[PDB]
């Protein structure tokens, strides 16, 4: 499941953490490397007092003085012209998500992106510096594409021309947290991702989440030692330092070699937030080392937000015509059962057509003190032993791909049930649909969720892995379950 | 309602139409008035060929060359370097409401936006030439806004920073297309239309209809005389032509003067959508004729787009907070009222306070063959008349803050039963809350709804109009309806 929280986090490397493996890649903290990618340099000072209290490293390269020697300094004194604005920008108490940007003149510009953690104001410097048009026209294109999938090449074909990445794709996340490449933007002749699935190991729990609050991050170079900060511990708490909100927080190692093994020198990506939940990402990869400007960036972001939008309204669309036709069916049945004397005979009526309701193969009907069937349903004993198993059953709608999950004693029934949708009208009466098994192939990016736990490094396999699923059915379609609900109520108050 | 068609229009007055007043100001075809305003140039081109069909008279100011001789020129002629584009960002049958942008260069640039109506394209000439990182900023301090009235104030406050107008404000619509202003902001001295709410007339059906397929349009001079087209009637057809997509489009001669009699020199508004509604608009005025930089306009519509997701978000978030106490409530409700016995003395428990769960002063109770009371109720003979009232009404759930619309008898009952929020049981048994008559004031800008369709032209009228209402009471929030329904369920599946 992808709505749930993230497991506890060991303690890091440098604090006597454990080692990170495949069989303990979800408490990983990655939001406390100590440590920064080597394009840029990372301050914390005081919230208060603007003293400078941790540096990294190489903050030699962009700044020009020494570590030891800016360590005490004040912002007031390093950024006499931004510390008024930076403070006015970032009041105490504000979210950790919030960002303030400006642009400083030094011996080369460079862009200075601030936020707050609790007690603590971080301060990122990169080096810095698109299209003239390319943004709006960009925003009118997405917004006048006809469905989701045309929306989404819009936006894969755009950041690539924006950007210039070997690879540009657009992954949507599954209720199960695994992603599918739902478009892709690429140079000739580097391989496909599209249309392939990937395991929610690929993208652990505290990463989603991190994800969801924090909405870009990125790898400028996946060969690139990581610079620490200096000391490491924040002095405020002698605790490590939040660096979940600074893009030049040190990827995690796993996901790191993960890049590696995957043949991709650089990567980044922008999240596609959807009433509060992580919907998907624009995964972006280039071969070779690759630090995108800042501005670019930006515009990404800004994307990452219209996508946002634009994903609810072509869903909600598509979602639209479909429930259209599927209430109009429901009022044809309501109208039909609202006078039915003989339930069985009413419902098994060819020109209502319960069966095309939910594009079933098969249909159980229980009224009175018998069942019918309609259509190719299991054989009369196992009709009574599934019905049995309905009343075990204690929800008021049965829902599955794959009845074999729920029920073993009903496995062998997946000739002719495999999906089904079964719904009680207070279980002596019900209503049962069955799809029957088919032959579904899941092309997978190298490994199925089973064999990700089989390796303890990251795999080196991403080329197509067809699984043979078997024991299911067509997938029932989420406006077909409201519909089965509706239908509930409907004969729950007629009947 | 603001869920609805406009209606019909008239013919435009160069065709005969009817001269337009406050009667059939719902009927003005504003799409179509066959000019435009005077600060940019318009051409209509074949979809197909690029020949220039129609041109606006003031075309030779931009262009450099007289209306007669460029109509009959192709585009691929005079735009040799944007036509092959401009087909190729506007693909035939794409909706008219996606836009290509691009800068020309000539004897001054010249910022050209192109879009496509039917099987004709259009074509809008206006001149063109912000701070570095306001945009980006503005978009993280929107998105950590704690509540929708913080994001309102941050939006005003942003977008007049940006564009230097006298007057930015954020107009919230409600569901009978009264507009709120619920965020101002002002240059010193300016009058203060803050917290004052406006007719639905100010802003007409077909007005509402076109702005949320458009989402941007202004008036850069309100005592500008529009240009018109030659010919004015589109050659391919001898009809009007579609102007709803132009940003040049001629506003209406009714908002002109109504823009006029509030003393605004120059207006501009961004639609905010959300799920397919109008929400809002950022309204902007200025005191003196003001013509905004396409860029800038740009910047405007990013800002209209993150303002129509974040305002789901914050009100998602102020939703969220009261229905989960709500909830709660019903919880313990519906523990309690599980093993009742004596419905009528579960609900009456002091314990359960049903009163403070819909803030209601009075509670009706129905049950068996009886009803109780709690807190302030009308007399008994009133009761059982609201009971019978009750049984004549149809639906299954009440709701009115102001039960002497509903119910004419009842009106003398508003000092105890002024709101009323009833649900049945399957009418002989329900549960009804009541709240007493308030003293209610709203301020509205100049006129009340009924004050509107008084003057055969728009008010001169702008100032604090306090509105006494009486018989109404404290709104139902609809949190309240919902658990209203929820209990109704609950209630009927228990007992
Ligand atoms: C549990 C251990 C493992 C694991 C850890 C891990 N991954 C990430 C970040 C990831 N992983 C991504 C996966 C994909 N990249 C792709 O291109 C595709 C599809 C073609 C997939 C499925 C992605 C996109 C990210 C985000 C970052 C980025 O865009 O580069 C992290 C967090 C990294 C960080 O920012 O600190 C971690 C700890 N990955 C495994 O495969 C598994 C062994
Ligand atoms: C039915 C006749 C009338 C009517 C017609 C009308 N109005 C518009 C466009 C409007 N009206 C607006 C109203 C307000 N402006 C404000 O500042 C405030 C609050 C302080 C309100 C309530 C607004 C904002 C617009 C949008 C355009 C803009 O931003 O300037 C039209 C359509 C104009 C067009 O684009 O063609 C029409 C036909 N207005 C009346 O008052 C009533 C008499």
């Known amino acids: 499941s992808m709505s749930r929280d993230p497991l506890p986090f060991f303690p890091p490397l440098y604090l006597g953490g454990p080692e990170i493996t495949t069989e303990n890649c979800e408490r990983e903290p990655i939001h406390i490397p100590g440590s920064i990618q080597p394009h840029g340099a990372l301050l914390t000072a005081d919230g208060h007092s603007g003293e400078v209290l941790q540096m990294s490293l190489n903050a030699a390269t962009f700044l020009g003085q020494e570590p030891t020697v800016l360590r005490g300094q004040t912002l007031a004194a390093l950024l006499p012209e931004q510390w008024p604005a930076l403070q006015a920008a970032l009041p105490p108490g504000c979210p950790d998500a919030l960002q303030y940007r400006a642009t400083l003149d030094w011996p080369g510009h460079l862009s200075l992106t601030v936020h707050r953690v609790g007690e603590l104001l971080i301060l990122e410097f990169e080096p810095t510096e698109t299209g003239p048009h390319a943004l709006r026209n960009a925003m009118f294109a997405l917004e006048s594409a006809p469905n989701l999938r045309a929306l989404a090449e819009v936006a894969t074909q755009t950041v690539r021309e924006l950007t210039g990445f070997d690879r540009v794709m657009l992954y949507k ?26 395991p929610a190991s690929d993208i652990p729990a505290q990463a989603r989440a991190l994800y969801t609050r924090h909405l870009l991050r990125l790898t400028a170079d996946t060969r690139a030692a990581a610079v620490p900060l200096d000391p490491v511990l924040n002095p405020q708490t002698n605790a490590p330092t939040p660096l979940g909100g600074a893009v030049l927080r040190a990827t995690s190692p796993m996901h790191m070699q993960y ?188 490994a199925t969720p089973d064999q990700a736990k089989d390796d303890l490094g990251p795999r080196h396999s991403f080329d197509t892995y067809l699984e043979e699923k078997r024991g299911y059915a067509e997938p029932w379609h989420p406006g077909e379950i409201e519909e089965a609900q509706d239908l509930r109520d409907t004969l729950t108050g007629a009947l």
């Open 173 to 198: 996340f599954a209720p199960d947290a695994t992603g599918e490449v739902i478009a892709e933007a690429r140079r000739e002749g580097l391989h496909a991702f599209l249309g392939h699935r990937f």
């Open 259 to 446: 890049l590696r093994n995957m043949g991709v020198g650089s990567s980044l990506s922008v999240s596609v937030v959807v009433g509060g939940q992580l919907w998907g990402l624009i995964a972006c990869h280039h071969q070779t080392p690759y630090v995108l400007p800042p501005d670019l960036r930006t515009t990404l972001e800004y994307l990452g937000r219209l996508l946002s939008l634009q994903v609810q309204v072509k869903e909600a669309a598509d979602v639209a015509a479909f429930r259209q036709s599927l209430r109009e069916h429901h009022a044809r049945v309501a109208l039909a059962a609202a006078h039915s004397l003989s339930p069985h005979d009413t419902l098994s009526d060819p020109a209502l057509d319960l069966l095309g309701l939910m594009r079933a193969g098969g249909l159980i009907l229980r009224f009175e003190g018998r069942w019918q069937t309609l259509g190719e349903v299991p054989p009369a004993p196992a009709v009574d032993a599934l019905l049995a198993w309905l009343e075990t059953q204690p929800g008021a709608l049965v829902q599955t791909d794959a009845l074999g999950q729920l029920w073993p004693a009903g496995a062998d029934l997946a000739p002719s049930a495999a999906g089904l949708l079964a719904i009680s009208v207070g279980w002596s009466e019900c209503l049962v649909w069955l799809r029957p098994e088919l032959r579904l192939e899941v092309a997978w990016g190298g």
